[PDB]
Structures are given as structure tokens and as C-alpha cells.
Design a protein around this ligand. Structure first.
Ligand SMILES: NS(=O)(=O)c1cc(C(=O)CSc2nc3cc(Br)ccc3[nH]2)ccc1Cl
Ligand SMILES: [Zn+2]
Length: 257
């Protein structure tokens, strides 16, 4: 029964998930002036040519586009990472209004939404084991601003009306996640956590500096989803973001400038 409301939202999560007040919680504000340029960071390697999407699911918090991660297909490596991480799913966080929705912020700026491409470290064999490790996951975070449409998003937007409510899913094959990436792979990176319960401190965050553009009509369609299940009172799925958490004893590193 965690969620995003007054009575079960982010300020409550610590009662069931006490690491909410831990030492490497996400998201955070990225202060671009105090991010350190790290000339030892490598270009990010994103190899999505063989990605195999399976399904899209409304899980009552967001929607997940899920991939077959049983072979070495869609992998993230390089950047700040030490080995190979396999794509398992992406999802977004977004707001009720274009002025909020991202979880990370950039000099306190909130974007309209934020995409998370979740990958697990192949040295741990699967996602469930990888989340128990401090280097288990790598999440590629991409900001969304409202402007032009993102054509490579439209296939996702079009299916949403089939998964309006919690627990619905739809076949979702042949979706190419390369169509959601901006031109540049310049990034910031820091050690953090899941931004949703159970808030495990297992993620290397890689947040792209360049946002993607989506249209107002595309994000409106995200806002028509529902947190409730079918046959329950309608609670629009909006504002499903955790606010920025204290940076504590961490440094955010930049791959550029
Ligand atoms: N928001 S996020 O930090 O990118 C993130 C979100 C998710 C979600 O699917 C959000 S809802 C959710 N995440 C879970 C993870 C575990 Br373990 C167990 C139950 C969960 N339910 C899974 C992984 C990551 Cl890394
Ligand atoms: Zn997320």
C-alpha cells in the first residue's frame, strides 16, 4: 500500500522501508556547477540493436515496458560501469502539469517527465539477485520536456489505452528503445537507489544531460492512465515521482565539459 498520495506517498515510505532515510537514496538534485568532470569516465555504450520487448504492464505506480533479458541482447556498458548490464524494463515518471514530473532535477529544474531504462549486472545472474548488491543495477535516466513529438514514443503512447488500470498488460513486441534516446550520450553519474520501494541501494545512476522532446499530446496520454484497478474509483496516474533526496556523502561526476 505505498503509493504517491498524501497518506501513502514519499513522506510515508520510511515506515515500511526504513532505508528511505539511508545514505545513498535517489533521486537527487544535480547541481551542475558542483558535478565534477571526470576525464577517466568512458563513453556510454548502449547496444540496443537486438532488444526484444515482450509486454507492457500497468503496475499501479507507472507502466513497465518489459524485455526478454534471458540472453545478451540489449546491454549497457562502459560509462562509469565495470561490467555488462542487461536491459530488463523501462518506465517513466511524470507530473500533473508540464512543470513537474521528473525525479532527478538539474539545478532545481524539474522536467515534465523522466524515463528510466533499468539494467542489471550480468555478474549476478538475474535482476532479483542483482538488487541485493551495491553495483547490481544501472539505470539510464533521460529527461522529457514538452515540445515536438517523439516519433519513437508513439507506439508506447498508442497502447496505453489498453492498459489503463492497475494489473493490465498488453503484448508489446518489436519496440525499439533506440527511438527514445537523445543525440548526445553526455551524462552525470552517482551511486544511488531505486526511487520506489523497496528503495534498495543498488543503482549506478547515469542521467543524460540532453532531454528528449515529447509533445503535449503524448504526455497527456500518460496522464490518462490510472493508479486504481478496473472497477475502482478513478485516480489519475500523475505525479508518480519521488522528490530529490539528500546527497549526503556523495559526488556527482560528469562525463563532459
Ligand atoms: N524508478 S527506478 O529506480 O528506475 C526502478 C523502478 C522499478 C519499478 O518497477 C518500480 S515499482 C517496483 N519496483 C520494485 C523493485 C523491487 Br526489487 C520489488 C518490487 C518493486 N516494485 C524497478 C527498478 C528500478 Cl531501478
Ligand atoms: Zn523509475
Amino acid at each position: 500500500h505505498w503509493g504517491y498520495g498524501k497518506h501513502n506517498g514519499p513522506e510515508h515510505w520510511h515506515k515500511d522501508f526504513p532505508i528511505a532515510k539511508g545514505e545513498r537514496q535517489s533521486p537527487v538534485d544535480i547541481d551542475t556547477h558542483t558535478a565534477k568532470y571526470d576525464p577517466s569516465l568512458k563513453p556510454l555504450s548502449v547496444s540496443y540493436d537486438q532488444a526484444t520487448s515482450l509486454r507492457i504492464l500497468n503496475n499501479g505506480h507507472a507502466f513497465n515496458v518489459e524485455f526478454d533479458d534471458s540472453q545478451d541482447k540489449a546491454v549497457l556498458k562502459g560509462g562509469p560501469l565495470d561490467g555488462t548490464y542487461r536491459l530488463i524494463q523501462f518506465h517513466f515518471h511524470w507530473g500533473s502539469l508540464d512543470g513537474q514530473g521528473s525525479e532527478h532535477t538539474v539545478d532545481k529544474k524539474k522536467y515534465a517527465a523522466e524515463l528510466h531504462l533499468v539494467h542489471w549486472n550480468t555478474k549476478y545472474g538475474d535482476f532479483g539477485k542483482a538488487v541485493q548488491q551495491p553495483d547490481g543495477l544501472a539505470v539510464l535516466g533521460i529527461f522529457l520536456k514538452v515540445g515536438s513529438a517523439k516519433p519513437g514514443l508513439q507506439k508506447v503512447v498508442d497502447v496505453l489505452d489498453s492498459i489503463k488500470t492497475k494489473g493490465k498488460s498488453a503484448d508489446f513486441t518489436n519496440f525499439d528503445p533506440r527511438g527514445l534516446l537523445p543525440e548526445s550520450l553526455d551524462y552525470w553519474t552517482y551511486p544511488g537507489s531505486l526511487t520506489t520501494p523497496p528503495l534498495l541501494e543498488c543503482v549506478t545512476w547515469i542521467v543524460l544531460k540532453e532531454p528528449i522532446s515529447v509533445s503535449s499530446e503524448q504526455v497527456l496520454k500518460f496522464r490518462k492512465l490510472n493508479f486504481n484497478g478496473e472497477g475502482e474509483p478513478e485516480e489519475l496516474m500523475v505525479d508518480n515521482w519521488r522528490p530529490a533526496q539528500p546527497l549526503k556523502n556523495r559526488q556527482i561526476k560528469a562525463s563532459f565539459k
